[PDB]
Swiss-Prot record:
<feature type="binding site">
    <location>
        <begin position="127"/>
        <end position="129"/>
    </location>
    <ligand>
        <name>hexadecanoate</name>
    </ligand>
</feature>
<dbReference type="InterPro" id="IPR031259">
    <property type="entry name" value="ILBP"/>
</dbReference>
<keyword id="KW-0446">Lipid-binding</keyword>
<keyword id="KW-0813">Transport</keyword>
<feature type="binding site">
    <location>
        <position position="107"/>
    </location>
    <ligand>
        <name>hexadecanoate</name>
    </ligand>
</feature>
<protein>
    <recommendedName>
        <fullName>Fatty acid-binding protein homolog 1</fullName>
    </recommendedName>
</protein>
<dbReference type="InterPro" id="IPR000566">
    <property type="entry name" value="Lipocln_cytosolic_FA-bd_dom"/>
</dbReference>
<dbReference type="InterPro" id="IPR000463">
    <property type="entry name" value="Fatty_acid-bd"/>
</dbReference>
<comment type="function">
    <text>Has been implicated in the acquisition, storage, and transport of lipids, and may be important to the organism since it is incapable of synthesizing most of its lipids de novo.</text>
</comment>
<comment type="similarity">
    <text>Belongs to the calycin superfamily. Fatty-acid binding protein (FABP) family.</text>
</comment>
<dbReference type="Pfam" id="PF00061">
    <property type="entry name" value="Lipocalin"/>
</dbReference>
<keyword id="KW-0007">Acetylation</keyword>
<feature type="modified residue" description="N-acetylmethionine">
    <location>
        <position position="1"/>
    </location>
</feature>
<dbReference type="InterPro" id="IPR012674">
    <property type="entry name" value="Calycin"/>
</dbReference>
<dbReference type="GO" id="GO:0008289">
    <property type="term" value="F:lipid binding"/>
</dbReference>
Length: 133
């Protein structure tokens, strides 16, 4: 998790519309989701716990978790999901099961850039972030 710590600003997004469409996100929310460019703040809480916070004009969302420990998450579009985050060969692997679809998120860091790949069924989205601090 150490590679992911800090603040990251979203620069570009591709395919997020298609992800939201597949997940059943409603029209108004999708309009918002396609516009916003969130920050992502990843913090070490000690004791193996971490927080991810996402700030945007839509809302602030966050979650605190330990690696390899299933937890309840609410997504930004207000689905209740069962989530599980691990790190494997440098890749943060974050699954979200909403009981209809499983969303697979992979985050990777190379230098100043964090790339978040989001997959639902065959749909692929990539969101690229730059390091702020
Ligand atoms: C901040 C905009 C929220 C818009 C609502 C979209 C809800 C779809 C949820 C997809 C799961 C979360 C994807 C996070 C990807 C990332 O870290 O950039």
């Amino acid at each position: 998790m150490e590679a992911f710590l800090g603040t990251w600003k979203m620069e570009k997004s591709e395919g997020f519309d298609k992800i939201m469409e597949r997940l059943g996100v409603d029209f108004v929310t999708r309009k918002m989701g396609n516009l916003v460019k969130p920050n992502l703040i990843v913090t070490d809480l000690g004791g193996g716990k971490y927080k991810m916070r996402s700030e945007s004009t839509f809302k602030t969302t966050e979650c605190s978790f330990k690696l390899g420990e299933k937890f309840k998450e609410v997504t930004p579009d207000s689905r209740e999901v069962a989530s599980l985050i691990t790190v494997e060969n440098g890749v943060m692997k974050h699954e979200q099961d909403d009981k209809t679809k499983v969303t697979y998120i992979e985050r990777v860091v190379e230098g100043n850039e964090l790339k978040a790949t989001v997959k639902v069924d065959e749909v692929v989205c990539v969101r690229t972030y730059s390091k702020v601090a």
